Amino acid sequence: MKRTFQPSVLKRNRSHGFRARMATKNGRQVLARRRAKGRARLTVSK
Amino acid sequence: AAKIRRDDEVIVLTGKDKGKRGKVKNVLSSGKVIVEGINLVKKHQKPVPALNQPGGIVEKEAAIQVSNVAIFNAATGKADRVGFRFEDGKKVRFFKSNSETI
Amino acid sequence: MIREERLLKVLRAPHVSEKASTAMEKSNTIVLKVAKDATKAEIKAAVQKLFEVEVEVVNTLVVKGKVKRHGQRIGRRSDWKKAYVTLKEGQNL
Amino acid sequence: SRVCQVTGKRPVTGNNRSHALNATKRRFLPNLHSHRFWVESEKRFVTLRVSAKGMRVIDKKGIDTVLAELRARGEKY
Amino acid sequence: GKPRPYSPRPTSHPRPIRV
Amino acid sequence: KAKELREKSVEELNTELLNLLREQFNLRMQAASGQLQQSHLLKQVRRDVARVKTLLNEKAGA
RNA sequence: UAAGGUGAUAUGAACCGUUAUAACCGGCGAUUUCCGAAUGGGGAAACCCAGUGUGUUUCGACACACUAUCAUUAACUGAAUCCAUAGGUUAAUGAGGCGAACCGGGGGAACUGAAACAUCUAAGUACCCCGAGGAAAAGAAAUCAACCGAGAUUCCCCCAGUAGCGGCGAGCGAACGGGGAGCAGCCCAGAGCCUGAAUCAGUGUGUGUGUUAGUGGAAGCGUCUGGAAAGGCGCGCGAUACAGGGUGACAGCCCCGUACACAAAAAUGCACAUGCUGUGAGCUCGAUGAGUAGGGCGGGACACGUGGUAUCCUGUCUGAAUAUGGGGGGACCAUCCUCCAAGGCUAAAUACUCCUGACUGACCGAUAGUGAACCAGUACCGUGAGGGAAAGGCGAAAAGAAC
RNA sequence: AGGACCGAACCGACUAAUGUUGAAAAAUUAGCGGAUGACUUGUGGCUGGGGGUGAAAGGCCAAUCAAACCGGGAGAUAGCU
RNA sequence: CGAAGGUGUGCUGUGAGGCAUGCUGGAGGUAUCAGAAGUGCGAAUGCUGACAUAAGUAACGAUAAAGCGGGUGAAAAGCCCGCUCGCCGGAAGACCAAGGGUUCCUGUCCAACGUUAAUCGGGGCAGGGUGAGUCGACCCCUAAGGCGAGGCCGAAAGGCGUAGUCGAUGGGAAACAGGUUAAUAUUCCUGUACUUGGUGUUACUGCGAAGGGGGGACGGAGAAGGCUAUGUUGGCCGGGCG
RNA sequence: UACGGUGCUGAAGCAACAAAUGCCCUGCUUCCAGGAAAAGCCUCUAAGCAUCAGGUAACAUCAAAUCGUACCCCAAACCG
Ligand SMILES: *[C@H]1O[C@H](CO)[C@H](O)[C@H](O)[C@H]1NC(C)=O
Ligand SMILES: [Mg+2]
Ligand SMILES: [Mg+2]
Ligand SMILES: [Mg+2]
Ligand SMILES: [Mg+2]
Ligand SMILES: [Mg+2]
Ligand SMILES: [Mg+2]
Ligand SMILES: [Mg+2]
Ligand SMILES: [Mg+2]
Ligand SMILES: [Mg+2]
Ligand SMILES: [Mg+2]
Ligand SMILES: [Mg+2]
Ligand SMILES: [Mg+2]
Ligand SMILES: [Mg+2]
Ligand SMILES: [Mg+2]
Ligand SMILES: [Mg+2]
Ligand SMILES: [Mg+2]
Ligand SMILES: [Mg+2]
Ligand SMILES: [Mg+2]
Ligand SMILES: [Mg+2]
Ligand SMILES: [Mg+2]
Ligand SMILES: [Mg+2]
Ligand SMILES: [Mg+2]
Ligand SMILES: [Mg+2]
Ligand SMILES: [Mg+2]
Ligand SMILES: [Mg+2]
Ligand SMILES: [Mg+2]
Ligand SMILES: [Mg+2]
Ligand SMILES: [Mg+2]
Ligand SMILES: [Mg+2]
Ligand SMILES: [Mg+2]
Ligand SMILES: [Mg+2]
Ligand SMILES: [Mg+2]
Ligand SMILES: [Mg+2]
Numbered sequence A: 001m002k003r004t005f006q007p008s009v010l011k012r013n014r015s016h017g018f019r020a021r022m023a024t025k026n027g028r029q030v031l032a033r034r035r036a037k038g039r040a041r042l043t044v045s046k
Numbered sequence B: 001a002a003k004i005r006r007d008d009e010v011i012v013l014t015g016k017d018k019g020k021r022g023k024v025k026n027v028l029s030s031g032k033v034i035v036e037g038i039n040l041v042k043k044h045q046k047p048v049p050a051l052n053q054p055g056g057i058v059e060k061e062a063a064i065q066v067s068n069v070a071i072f073n074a075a076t077g078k079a080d081r082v083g084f085r086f087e088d089g090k091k092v093r094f095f096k097s098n099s100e101t102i
Numbered sequence C: 001m002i003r004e005e006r007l008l009k010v011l012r013a014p015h016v017s018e019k020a021s022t023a024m025e026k027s028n029t030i031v032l033k034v035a036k037d038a039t040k041a042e043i044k045a046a047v048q049k050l051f052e053v054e055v056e057v058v059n060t061l062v063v064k065g066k067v068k069r070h071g072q073r074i075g076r077r078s079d080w081k082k083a084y085v086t087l088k089e090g091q092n093l
Numbered sequence D: 001s002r003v004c005q006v007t008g009k010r011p012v013t014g015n016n017r018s019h020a021l022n023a024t025k026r027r028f029l030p031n032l033h034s035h036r037f038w039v040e041s042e043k044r045f046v047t048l049r050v051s052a053k054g055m056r057v058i059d060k061k062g063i064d065t066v067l068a069e070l071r072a073r074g075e076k077y
Numbered sequence E: 001g002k003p004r005p006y007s008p009r010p011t012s013h014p015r016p017i018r019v
Numbered sequence F: 001k002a003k004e005l006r007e008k009s010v011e012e013l014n015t016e017l018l019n020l021l022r023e024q025f026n027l028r029m030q031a032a033s034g035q036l037q038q039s040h041l042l043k044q045v046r047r048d049v050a051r052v053k054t055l056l057n058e059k060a061g062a
Numbered sequence G: 001u002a003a004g005g006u007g008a009u010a011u012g013a014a015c016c017g018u019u020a021u022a023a024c025c026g027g028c029g030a031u032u033u034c035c036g037a038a039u040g041g042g043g044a045a046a047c048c049c050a051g052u053g054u055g056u057u058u059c060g061a062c063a064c065a066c067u068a069u070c071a072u073u074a075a076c077u078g079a080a081u082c083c084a085u086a087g088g089u090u091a092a093u094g095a096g097g098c099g100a101a102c103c104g105g106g107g108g109a110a111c112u113g114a115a116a117c118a119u120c121u122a123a124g125u126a127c128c129c130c131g132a133g134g135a136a137a138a139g140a141a142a143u144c145a146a147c148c149g150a151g152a153u154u155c156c157c158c159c160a161g162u163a164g165c166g167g168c169g170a171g172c173g174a175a176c177g178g179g180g181a182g183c184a185g186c187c188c189a190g191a192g193c194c195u196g197a198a199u200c201a202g203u204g205u206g207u208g209u210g211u212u213a214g215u216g217g218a219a220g221c222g223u224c225u226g227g228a229a230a231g232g233c234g235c236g237c238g239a240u241a242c243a244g245g246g247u248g249a250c251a252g253c254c255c256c257g258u259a260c261a262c263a264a265a266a267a268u269g270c271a272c273a274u275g276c277u278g279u280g281a282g283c284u285c286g287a288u289g290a291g292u293a294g295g296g297c298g299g300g301a302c303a304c305g306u307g308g309u310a311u312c313c314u315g316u317c318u319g320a321a322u323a324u325g326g327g328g329g330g331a332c333c334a335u336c337c338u339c340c341a342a343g344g345c346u347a348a349a350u351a352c353u354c355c356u357g358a359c360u361g362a363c364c365g366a367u368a369g370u371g372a373a374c375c376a377g378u379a380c381c382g383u384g385a386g387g388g389a390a391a392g393g394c395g396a397a398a399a400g401a402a403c
Numbered sequence H: 001a002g003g004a005c006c007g008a009a010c011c012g013a014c015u016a017a018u019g020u021u022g023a024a025a026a027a028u029u030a031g032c033g034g035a036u037g038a039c040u041u042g043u044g045g046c047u048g049g050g051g052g053u054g055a056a057a058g059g060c061c062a063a064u065c066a067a068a069c070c071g072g073g074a075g076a077u078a079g080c081u
Numbered sequence I: 001c002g003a004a005g006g007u008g009u010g011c012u013g014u015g016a017g018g019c020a021u022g023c024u025g026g027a028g029g030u031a032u033c034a035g036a037a038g039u040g041c042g043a044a045u046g047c048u049g050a051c052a053u054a055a056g057u058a059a060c061g062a063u064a065a066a067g068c069g070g071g072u073g074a075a076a077a078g079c080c081c082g083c084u085c086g087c088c089g090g091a092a093g094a095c096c097a098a099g100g101g102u103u104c105c106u107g108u109c110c111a112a113c114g115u116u117a118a119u120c121g122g123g124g125c126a127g128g129g130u131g132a133g134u135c136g137a138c139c140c141c142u143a144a145g146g147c148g149a150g151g152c153c154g155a156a157a158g159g160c161g162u163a164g165u166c167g168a169u170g171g172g173a174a175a176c177a178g179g180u181u182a183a184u185a186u187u188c189c190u191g192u193a194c195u196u197g198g199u200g201u202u203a204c205u206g207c208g209a210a211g212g213g214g215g216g217a218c219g220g221a222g223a224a225g226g227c228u229a230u231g232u233u234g235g236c237c238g239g240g241c242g
Numbered sequence J: 001u002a003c004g005g006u007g008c009u010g011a012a013g014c015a016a017c018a019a020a021u022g023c024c025c026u027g028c029u030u031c032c033a034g035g036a037a038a039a040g041c042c043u044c045u046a047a048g049c050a051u052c053a054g055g056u057a058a059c060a061u062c063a064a065a066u067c068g069u070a071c072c073c074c075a076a077a078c079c080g
């Protein structure tokens, strides 16, 4: 059966990537939360 | 400064080798000193192909806590404590209970 | 024209392997480890100036570092650039 | 935004109150009108978005005085 | 201890309906 | 080498940098090849390049 | 500051140093790739692609610098359109983003309680948003009081769960006055005289005193048990030092400290002193904040739910008197008292702790205490926001077991 | 010519058996329907939660849907066990 | 000259308990009288870790299928080599994109991983390996759509959108055959090509854009002819005489 | 022959027939549901530049960077 995760690096980066996060204030708040928590990987970009 | 140094002739205050006198070969940063013919151990050396051909139960000196050896005054013939003075610029070391520079 | 200071920082080591040995005795070619930011032009300038040989064409590739394990702690070796440097008919290195 | 350029009147929030005193949030919007004002200094028409109250302030103080206050606060017209 | 329980999975038979 | 190279001019110190960088290339070649037991030479020259580049900035004005 | 050093797992290798250029520690400099506000344009962050101007070219090219946006200001220029204005270009200065809490403002729930529920409550709470500072805000009476008086603001303890408010239910809940902490008053709405005289701010320059490395720092031996002594036993000694830590078992005197006494080439904080620059005191006369106060309508805030409801704010429509005047004293009127709105500034007492140092605990001691004593916001899970572990102890010494 | 006919790929899912701690959190096997169309499929894009989208089944919106998921109000409340 | 803890034993009190002591353990413990509580567990389909039971039971993942000889090895149904057998062959072969990221090749090892053994492996360890003017990306160009100087709009946050600027799944220059590595090849080598731009020389000369026009540039279905890939047969050549 | 694979030489290399869903064909015929865009490219001039720049052709020389390239890919390497 076709499962839900059908990987595409382009879609991944555009939907969740660093620049996508930076584009909106809510996205920048995601980065702020993740830095505050001290995540080693802020976004999928890596 | 360090009260016990390299080349200093010391006497052991505590341990299996108490009363025995030796010269300090080197001082480790962990407040420990190697004193020749003092804290002997029997190391079971593995057979190395490259450096040192044989194995053999090697007899070598183990580090002893620097606070377990005192400087040997030589004159009095017993353990002494080291103090610090200034005798024309340089910082020197002197014995306690007599007061003579090393 | 490229500065000698830059030409002294692009050649890291000669690459030693069977393919490098074969290339040096078959297609008069020397295999060099080079700086990852070095260009074909900079390699062709550096070999000519530092080894005093005549270079025909530089071929380059980037070697991706391997993921190695050291005491159940995952690590990655650095990517490096490999230069296949073809010399002329009779030069020798 | 719905802000009077003269006075600075803007939407304020209050309640609708029914007979049974049910409080639902509403806004009170200013009585805003885009109006062309004639100035006797710059021989030109100035279009200000102004409340009806703001138009009475211009009638009282004069357009010259009011435009001076806009420049003081740093509001482009 | 006990592992986290599974989300619902397919069931072979309908529960009998008593009514 | 902090007082010695300070007596030199910019026109005598650049050539000195073009002797060290060249020496660092020769040592880097010898080290990779399998030659050079004296591995400490790599650090001496790397730090010597640093000293020379440091004085160049002082001679410049900064 | 120094006889030892080249950070850790982690040895080894090659070395450096031992009286001063080893290393280490501190001040001040230098260097400081790429991404990121990211700012030369772009972009799927750590990449792609330029323009311009210098300088170098071995003519293949190479190096360095600058080029975002917005605001303000200035210069130059410049439409419809005559003047002009808009617009355009260039320069200068500033801004931008991040950060725990505290602070002011703009918006603003519901669960819940009311033993249902709608007024009410929860609550101006959570949350979102904007802005600021080391604090913020507030602040120099159009304040209270009660015919006696007080004298800006803020915070604390009372007043008091009182007076009130309240489907008079559930609940909500003052003030006056008193005791404290702290205390400070000023300026513009203006012209002249006299002069730049008070005082807060930068600015160097001296003076002390802190901070950022450090220096000296007392006094114990014998014997017994033991693997080992710091323990037992005996006899001494220091104490402005018996805080604490370490050392082969429990050490004032073995070590590091501790009390105590000293220390700065360099940078910097604070407080005085003294030049420089700006700032303008004092006296006389005058002035005294209008689409404002007040009102009608609709809301909101006041403990106060419109009530008999003062007072405050204003979305809407109106609209005075302006000192011979005006505001308030809880409907309202008279009398009396008290104050002077419609301009602004202002330290202290107050709030908070992402972070730094010291010290403390009838706090925890590995299922506890942080989620995390351990390479943990990791592994792992999830498209993502996000979720999120487990896992400490050989020995005094590796003497980590040759053969 | 054709939402024409038979029939592979391809798309689907009518019946039966199996499987039901499966080979599989929806399948396998044998048959079955459509198969030039209102077809099917790759890549990328857009629509967001009382909102979307729906040839309409309250279907579908990441194995979740008569109001997604994650964090927060939050230790909601629980005359019940 | 042996603390806590652990584990036996004896004694003792009405009970919760207490005391003594052998063994273990190897450094703590703490009377009395007060003081303070994270102060006592069998249940909460409690929580975490450990370990049972069923049970050496079910099962070992397509019923395409194996047999033997030799080799290596401590050991071979499973590895290597050989012969035979069987299975797929519009695939169960080959080459890619997407996605993964070293799984590739070589040597070495067999704890764990592999539903068995394993000498084997996509497993461990080490070393190697990816070569481009022409392939693709980047790049030029746009689609849907995104972002968007000014701008319009909106309590704030923001929304929309102009000039622009991004955005392929589409348009845009050029390389082929043969050979070669353990592992790359239109990339290396050999042979033979081609494209675009810069510079210089020579001759001849209207060049010049952000503008105009052309072109690029496009549907479904159907039909037929001409072809090639490709196959078949004959000839040809080499070998064969079972 | 290290039984893995290197070195060396080399015959014929034609024809007929069949034939695609590939090519001619972005064609042709036909139908209604009427079938991207922009650049490269070609051409035209404007401002401007005038025996200059620039354009065309031939010849010579130089440049074409950077990143991907292993391997699996209907699968034991991707999603389960
Ligand atoms: C299994 O039970 C669920 C309910 O839990 C559904 O009814 C489902 O349809 C059942 N399936 C079968 C095969 O009966
Ligand atoms: Mg080549
Ligand atoms: Mg390449
Ligand atoms: Mg349990
Ligand atoms: Mg940018
Ligand atoms: Mg940039
Ligand atoms: Mg661009
Ligand atoms: Mg800021
Ligand atoms: Mg209720
Ligand atoms: Mg109730
Ligand atoms: Mg203030
Ligand atoms: Mg009075
Ligand atoms: Mg000291
Ligand atoms: Mg001392
Ligand atoms: Mg003793
Ligand atoms: Mg012990
Ligand atoms: Mg007044
Ligand atoms: Mg009013
Ligand atoms: Mg009134
Ligand atoms: Mg009033
Ligand atoms: Mg009144
Ligand atoms: Mg009254
Ligand atoms: Mg824990
Ligand atoms: Mg424990
Ligand atoms: Mg992931
Ligand atoms: Mg049909
Ligand atoms: Mg269906
Ligand atoms: Mg079927
Ligand atoms: Mg049919
Ligand atoms: Mg059919
Ligand atoms: Mg229904
Ligand atoms: Mg679903
Ligand atoms: Mg609901
Ligand atoms: Mg609550």
Ligand SMILES: [Mg+2]
Residues within 6 Å of the ligand: H075
């Ligand atoms: Mg609860």
Ligand SMILES: [Mg+2]
Residues within 6 Å of the ligand: none
């Ligand atoms: Mg204890």
Ligand SMILES: [Mg+2]
Residues within 6 Å of the ligand: none
């Ligand atoms: Mg006690």
Ligand SMILES: [Mg+2]
Residues within 6 Å of the ligand: none
């Ligand atoms: Mg308890």
Ligand SMILES: [Mg+2]
Residues within 6 Å of the ligand: none
């Ligand atoms: Mg229990």
Ligand SMILES: [Mg+2]
Residues within 6 Å of the ligand: I043
């Ligand atoms: Mg019980």
Ligand SMILES: [Mg+2]
Residues within 6 Å of the ligand: none
């Ligand atoms: Mg079990």
Ligand SMILES: [Mg+2]
Residues within 6 Å of the ligand: I057
């Ligand atoms: Mg059974």
Ligand SMILES: [Mg+2]
Residues within 6 Å of the ligand: none
């Ligand atoms: Mg059975």
Ligand SMILES: [Mg+2]
Residues within 6 Å of the ligand: none
């Ligand atoms: Mg069975």
Ligand SMILES: [Mg+2]
Residues within 6 Å of the ligand: none
């Ligand atoms: Mg099987």
Ligand SMILES: [Mg+2]
Residues within 6 Å of the ligand: none
């Ligand atoms: Mg066999």
Ligand SMILES: [Mg+2]
Residues within 6 Å of the ligand: none
């Ligand atoms: Mg075995």
Ligand SMILES: [Mg+2]
Residues within 6 Å of the ligand: I077, I078
């Ligand atoms: Mg088999």
Ligand SMILES: [Mg+2]
Residues within 6 Å of the ligand: none
């Ligand atoms: Mg076989």
Ligand SMILES: [Mg+2]
Residues within 6 Å of the ligand: none
């Ligand atoms: Mg691997």
